[PDB]
Amino acid sequence: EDAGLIQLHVAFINGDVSILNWDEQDQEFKLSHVPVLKTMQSGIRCFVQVLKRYYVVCTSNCTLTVWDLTNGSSNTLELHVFNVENDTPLALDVFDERSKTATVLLIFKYSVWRLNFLPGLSVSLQSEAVGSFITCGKRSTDGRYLLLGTSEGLIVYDLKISDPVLRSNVSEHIECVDIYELFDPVYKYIVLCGAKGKQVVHVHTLRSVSGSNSHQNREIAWVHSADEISVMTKACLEPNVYLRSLMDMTRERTQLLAVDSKERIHLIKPAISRISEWSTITPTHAASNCKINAISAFNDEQIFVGYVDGVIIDVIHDTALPQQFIEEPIDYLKQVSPNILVASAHSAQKTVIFQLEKIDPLQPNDQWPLMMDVSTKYASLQEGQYIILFSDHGVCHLDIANPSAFVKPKDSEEYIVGFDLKNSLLFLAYENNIIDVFRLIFSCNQLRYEQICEEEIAQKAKISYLVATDDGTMLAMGFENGTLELFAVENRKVQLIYSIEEVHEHCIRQLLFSPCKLLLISCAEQLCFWNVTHMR
Amino acid sequence: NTLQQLKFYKPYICDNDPKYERLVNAILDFLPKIEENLICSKYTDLLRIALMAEDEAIFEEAHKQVQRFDDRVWFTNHGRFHQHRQIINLGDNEGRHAVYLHN
């Protein structure tokens, strides 16, 4: 208030590259006399300092400039900006305030700038390491603690004054669209609620024994074994067993974790892969040229597979490296057979023979991407065009492949499907609101009024899988872009549980089960607790 | 989606005991906590997650329904400290701008 001493005025800048002030103390606007002065060019984020004589101005060039209200217009202090190079092209971030009459607040990208009287360069703080920065929060009555973060589609961070501690937690995840976020004062009693991009609301209580749950848990893997459930998480191995709350924390900073068939530990290290009985010095050898994204292990001890950033694929304890002749690999898989088929980005399937070749693994069928499954004797190739079946001549080596069932489906084809066990039939289901069960034969698109096969009431994009099950019908799975449902071959029946809570399912959507032995069922997204569910 | 429900819950406790009373007082929790979904298609989670904090014999009385044949649901979904939540937002719908009232 520059008039009475009542109320806070409003001011902004039009496309006239001049400052515009509005004086409102009661009801309707006044605009007394002249603006008394203008502002050179235009900025983006502008606000008043602790003194009414000075106005901080921020432009789209991410620079710090100031035009004084009194004592001339443009004076000084364009000097010493920390970083002029943005991670992604944008404007300057939102300027903030403090409860102090001197110290002020600012945030720029991944860093937080706390400022003070005198030209600047006072306090610079960062909570921790990590997309583009858009949305940000703020607090007032709560003690002026600053809500912030790099991107944080999960676990938005809060910063307490002068201390690097996180008292806030997000179990609801979040999506990212708009900039709106804020927390209620709470009028006395304490608890918090806020809204964000997903158009939802988080409710949280800061009371707890320990924080720092951020980087410990993101995805979830599982130990392959027989009738034994052991789950793993981010930061490599965290021991977990049936009906036990015991948890240990050790971080070697793994990228993506896979598990062998036995108790042997298979893991990944930045820019290398490691295979060991237990992990101490973790011995290994690799000819790999660059960093590997993910690495996995078979059941049997024969060779290994994985997709690297480059041609070379490393193995351990075994000789006879793969033949390659492919740009970069995409989809891998596990087989107990000596021969292993591997999908590729060039969409040319590769035949890997153990400890020998005597064949040329060149099969450039189509330029449409391949993704494949297998039933028993037949290799099932699902392309971006049609689905073709191969007949294996032998488990030792694969030379010729006899075509059996190939057909061109309806427009807007389905991404990926799945098959049952101890059945080996033909199944083709359209992606939107319909699923059909067929017979092997040559090809059958016919259904008509003969019989009614299941139903699809939900799934549209990214249909996932399905598998053999107990007596009644068959089960389908996956949380991606929807939920999983249950239906009957000749009839309609009840369907299973919801996607647990959060959206954006983790990279591996596979469900943990034994087909005829099924008891426990484990499903989770990010921060979810023990997944154990059984039947009596 | 509730106050009416909720509004029922003040008067209609007319004759009951702490069993039923805290049962509702609890169930008040689900009311935010419950999620809007495919409606009743996926009715399934609600039943078993009513047992998260259990003063209730309800699901034990549901033993005459929840277990029936292969037609409706089978015994699954156990939980007992699973799925977290205590989440108050049931809407999936669109929005642009939002903020709290100062009062």
From Swiss-Prot, chain A:
WD repeats: 12-77, 131-167, 458-497, 503-536
GO cellular component terms given for this protein: apoptosome
Region beta-propellor 2 (7 WD repeats): start-end pairs: 238-536
KW Repeat (keyword) present: yes
Keywords: Apoptosis, Repeat, WD repeat
Extent of the signal sequence: none
Domain notes: Possesses an N-terminal caspase activation and recruitment domain (CARD). At high protein concentrations in vitro the CARD domain mediates the interaction of two octomeric apoptosome rings to form a double ring structure.
Subunit structure: Exists as an auto-inhibited monomer; this state is maintained by intramolecular interactions between the NB-ARC and WD repeat domains. In vitro, at high protein concentrations or in the presence of non-physiologically high dATP concentrations, assembles into homooctomeric rings 300A in diameter to form the apoptosome complex; two rings can interact face to face (via CARD domains with some involvement of the WD repeat beta-propellors) to form a double ring structure. The octomeric ring may represent a non-functional or off-pathway conformation.
Record protein name field: Apoptosome protein Dark
Taxonomic placement: Eukaryota, Metazoa, Ecdysozoa, Arthropoda, Hexapoda
Shown chain mapped onto the complete sequence: 721 to 1264 of 1440
